[PDB]
Design a protein around this ligand. Sequence first.
Ligand SMILES: Nc1ncnc2c1ncn2[C@@H]1O[C@H](COP(=O)(O)OP(=O)(O)OP(=O)(O)O)[C@@H](O)[C@H]1O
Ligand SMILES: Nc1ncnc2c1ncn2[C@@H]1O[C@H](COP(=O)(O)OP(=O)(O)OP(=O)(O)O)[C@@H](O)[C@H]1O
Ligand SMILES: Nc1ncnc2c1ncn2[C@@H]1O[C@H](COP(=O)(O)OP(=O)(O)OP(=O)(O)O)[C@@H](O)[C@H]1O
Ligand SMILES: [Mg+2]
Ligand SMILES: [Mg+2]
Ligand SMILES: [Mg+2]
Lengths: 275, 510, 511, 5, 7
Amino acid sequence: MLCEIECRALSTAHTRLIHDFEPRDALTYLEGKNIFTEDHSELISKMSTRLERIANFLRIYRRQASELGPLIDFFNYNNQSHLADFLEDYIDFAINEPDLLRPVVIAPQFSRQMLDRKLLLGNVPKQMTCYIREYHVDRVIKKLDEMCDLDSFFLFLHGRAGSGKSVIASQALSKSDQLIGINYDSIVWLKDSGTAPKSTFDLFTDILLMLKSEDDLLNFPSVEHVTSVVLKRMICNALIDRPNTLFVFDDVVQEETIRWAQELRLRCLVTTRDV
Amino acid sequence: MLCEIECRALSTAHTRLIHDFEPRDALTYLEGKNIFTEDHSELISKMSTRLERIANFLRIYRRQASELGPLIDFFNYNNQSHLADFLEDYIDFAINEPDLLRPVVIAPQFSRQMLDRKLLLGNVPKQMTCYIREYHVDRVIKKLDEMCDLDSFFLFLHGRAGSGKSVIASQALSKSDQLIGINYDSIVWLKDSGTAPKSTFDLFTDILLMLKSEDDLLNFPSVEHVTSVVLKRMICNALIDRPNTLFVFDDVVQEETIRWAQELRLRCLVTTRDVEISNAASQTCEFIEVTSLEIDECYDFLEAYGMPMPVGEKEEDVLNKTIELSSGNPATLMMFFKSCEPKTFEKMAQLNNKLESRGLVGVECITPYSYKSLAMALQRCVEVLSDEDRSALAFAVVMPPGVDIPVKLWSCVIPVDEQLDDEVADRLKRLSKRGALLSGKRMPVLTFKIDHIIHMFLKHVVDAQTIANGISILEQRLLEIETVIRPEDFPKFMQLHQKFYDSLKNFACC
Amino acid sequence: MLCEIECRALSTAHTRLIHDFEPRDALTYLEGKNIFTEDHSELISKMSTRLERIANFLRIYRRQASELGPLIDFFNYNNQSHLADFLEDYIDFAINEPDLLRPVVIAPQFSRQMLDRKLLLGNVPKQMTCYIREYHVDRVIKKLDEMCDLDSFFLFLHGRAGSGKSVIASQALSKSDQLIGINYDSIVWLKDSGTAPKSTFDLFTDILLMLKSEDDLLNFPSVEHVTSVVLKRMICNALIDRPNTLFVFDDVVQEETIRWAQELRLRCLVTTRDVEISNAASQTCEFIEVTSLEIDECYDFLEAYGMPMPVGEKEEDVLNKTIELSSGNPATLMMFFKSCEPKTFEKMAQLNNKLESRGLVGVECITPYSYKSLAMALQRCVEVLSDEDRSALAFAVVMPPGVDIPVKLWSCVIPVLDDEVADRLKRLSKRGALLSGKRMPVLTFKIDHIIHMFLKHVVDAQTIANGISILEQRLLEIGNNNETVIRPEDFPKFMQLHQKFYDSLKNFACC
Amino acid sequence: LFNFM
Amino acid sequence: PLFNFMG
Ligand SMILES: Nc1ncnc2c1ncn2[C@@H]1O[C@H](COP(=O)(O)OP(=O)(O)OP(=O)(O)O)[C@@H](O)[C@H]1O
Ligand SMILES: Nc1ncnc2c1ncn2[C@@H]1O[C@H](COP(=O)(O)OP(=O)(O)OP(=O)(O)O)[C@@H](O)[C@H]1O
Ligand SMILES: Nc1ncnc2c1ncn2[C@@H]1O[C@H](COP(=O)(O)OP(=O)(O)OP(=O)(O)O)[C@@H](O)[C@H]1O
Ligand SMILES: [Mg+2]
Ligand SMILES: [Mg+2]
Ligand SMILES: [Mg+2]
């Protein structure tokens, strides 16, 4: 298999790999340097359009070869050197440099991404604007950054009632661009306010659904009946698709919440009154 | 069909079978060597994503082939030889050179980020960090390493209630990088706590479901109603895809669990309070007892979470009071810390007072323990007791705690349906064995002892009458004709222990 | 079609048939020597990859040709002779030799196959290890081998309750490697314990499912409703996929089981307590009786789990007290061990006391046995009993246990030429091994000790003293008519010989 | 007879 | 009573 840089190269150079190329030209050469097979090559050699031979050459190639060598050492010989120069230049801009781009910005207007799209879909409320408590929103953002490395943690933004905690959490995740995107991939903000004993399970049921794809919200079952251990397993399951994910638990009252959050090894912001 | 070794190879080598492979590449090469069927090949040939064809290829394959031959003889031909070389390496460092398997072909791929994934998916609770009991977690890991070869076995991590067992198991599967990956491929950690007779089946329903793939969690049938023989068979079925799988059974009370676990030839860690459930198993049974926290370890535990160490003599005494009171017990010590508010040694002695004049309810608190106070725990342990043993326990109140005392001296307060009272010893043994309520000590003379926590449990918990009745019923036999046991020249006068008796008699005029 | 050897050749030589070959080269030659067809050959000649032409040449070839000739006589001519030499050599290593491999071993670690995989999937329990009864497990394995040829048969591993039968069956199928793999292909071990009339059908329902593939356990229907003849047909159906299959029927109580097993022409091992269920089967019925643990095997059994062997004479006597009481019985011996706590001979004799003055309830413990005490087991063995046999047994309390005594000496206490007493006592030993027959010196029976202290704290407190009186009565009426030695007929008139124990029993009823 | 068998 | 509701 390749990796992120080399697949970024095979992906980046596609506008180019379509204007001039043909995989049959390379099939013998890869059947040769021992990186292909005559059924693989059968699959790629009898294909009606060239976009076929190209898409199969790029899918099929990534499994057999230990690296992206016998394709730079080919666009050279094939008078298609304008390809292999771009690719060797890129391999030099990665083998020869310990610096690239980090998690930052190169396709701007995260203003509709992070602000609009991700905040909104995680049900984060529309941050307050006409007044901001500097100190607190600041320390929240800080103390969230210090922990973006961590696997699971509690940040307790605790105070009096109506003391303004939730609003400040609204603001700390809506101001910056780091917390969502740089430090954490996604956001899930859920209000608890659970008092009954059935409430702490219902909560993580709607987490489990805050997680689920736009596809299969239709398929939603009579999920109401299934043990807690199964909902828990289903969450920490569906939690694979979620690298660095932040959880806001607005207005927690029951410590059963916090216990589930800690069995489920979640990363949690918590607005609450009882400390 | 394969087995646990060949499947341990197929499971260990999965990050790779995901990085470079395709089951379509192998279907044609395999219908030939006689390992498939046209529905098998139908099921694996039409699948939208590849992880589907791979999970179906490894499921159907682990069932179909007489051996793991026609899969080495394929990654080879397909230039994915970088795979078949790895698997032939594992099978060779398996049949011919054993032992060498863990250091050589298994270890060079450990990764402290894959573990947390495996722990989490096996629902292992987050290991404790601000203090670790070196010895026990160490010996657990050692004794687990010694048995990973074995096909099925019981390790019983048994102790008092709140004695700290489960946490230690959490740490023992979280310390090393060996136990998961090197010694065992996967973990399933399930808390039992089953009391109903239906509980022991529901548990293994959720084992069976802890096993099942994220796919076909959708498909769960009305299995709630399905025989025991079928849940068992369904498990040992779905258990093929699980080479060396470890089972933590946190807090087992019913020996029906242990019987299923041993019929299912499972590899089990078992945290429990009642130790005798192991009599259910005719097998390799090995034990690790979580004793009460020694006096020095308590210091370590306090320092560990930031507690100011004494200076004055009556401050080290305040803390020896706590250590004496909570007769070395993690959970009540923790509730104690969590409840020490100002942090002062002073308010700590305040609590030291509160414990004698309000029992555990004086220091009951929100703690990492599922329980407000150790009494909610001892509750169950006391209900489960054989009715007669329930009686013996109910009476061991009127003793002196943290004092080693002879059996006949017990024969006085303790009930029985002649002249040899050994029956007292039989009951007191069941009684320490089953929740660690007593304390046996063979020589100089056959003596037991009631600890301090296990006493103030009974204080504010048994019927107000039975105390004064046991005290008088004691004062009757009381006459007939330090690190030193009380001699037989001096039993007629228990007056040595008047203090802790002046306290119950004051207690019982209220 | 080919056969097992020749298809083993076409299967064995595949790593080879892939490196150098092409079926088109052969198509004309097979279209020619009359073993193919031009659509067959069409199917194989226009195929994109070579692995296609090869897999179709090997599937398609096996139907048309009477043998594997026109393919050896081809790899020769095609400069691919390195193939045809391997294949002619193999055909020589089969046409020319009446010897190959038999059912044995050439891919080792049947240790995870037969031990782990097949035993476990057939729900066979995890064989005992710290002690094995040689003789019995041995004869089981033997008598199973002798029959691996047979189409259906009953092996009755019958004995007392807790006598250890199931454990021995566990061991006989978990030790060897022959029984599973060599002699029989698969194992199915199912516990009966059926008492209701609905139980014997439910059993074979879970057989039918013990059989079913990992696929279609999902498809399990509301199968609960379908006639017995249909479940039976469904089993003997699904039984095609099962060449030489062994059936263990652990703990059978109802003879309806045995009848279904015999209508379904099954091969059966049976652990049971009641021996007469074999009269249900009209067949080679073969038997292995599980006797009481001999005094020396009891020693072996004690040593085996670490119990210290005697020294003083009244310590070997203390342990002969135990071996005498639990009249050689695995289960109660085990409960006994599990409950001997400190391990001392002292606390052991303590239990020896506890047993006479509190009965079996005195040593009841957590044991690998499903039963808290052997009395819970014998319970059932006693309920099934004919009402009249229930009576005879209920009265045999007032006898001397571990004493060989005449039929007439029994006719005094037992209800109704009174040989009929003997007939009942026979039914009674046959059906739970509750008694003990001994043909000569004189037709005499005997009641053991375990089978007594069951009855002590179990029969009506009155009926004890009444049996004692009904005896002292008919004894006296016999009085009015006028060691390795049986009690003579000049001396039945005084049961006072056993006065000691008779004196104890009496205190129990009268108080 | 037989206290619950 | 014989136990304040067992504890
Ligand atoms: N910038 C601000 N900071 C704090 N509070 C504000 C701000 N702007 C308006 N408020 C008012 O204060 C109210 C209380 O804020 P908030 O909802 O955060 O309370 P809370 O901390 O969530 O209390 P609880 O947890 O009990 O709901 C808001 O609903 C709003 O009416
Ligand atoms: N190593 C440790 N570090 C910090 N705290 C501990 C540790 N061990 C125990 N404790 C404290 O004691 C409490 C009880 O621990 P634990 O849950 O392990 O008890 P347990 O042995 O499982 O008892 P039970 O079997 O009754 O559940 C914990 O919740 C924690 O508060
Ligand atoms: N090697 C052994 N042989 C026989 N019995 C043993 C052995 N080891 C332990 N035992 C004890 O003897 C008990 C009785 O054995 P087993 O379960 O085979 O009785 P059984 O013959 O099946 O009686 P039933 O058919 O009435 O259940 C076992 O549960 C176990 O406690
Ligand atoms: Mg709020
Ligand atoms: Mg626990
Ligand atoms: Mg049995």
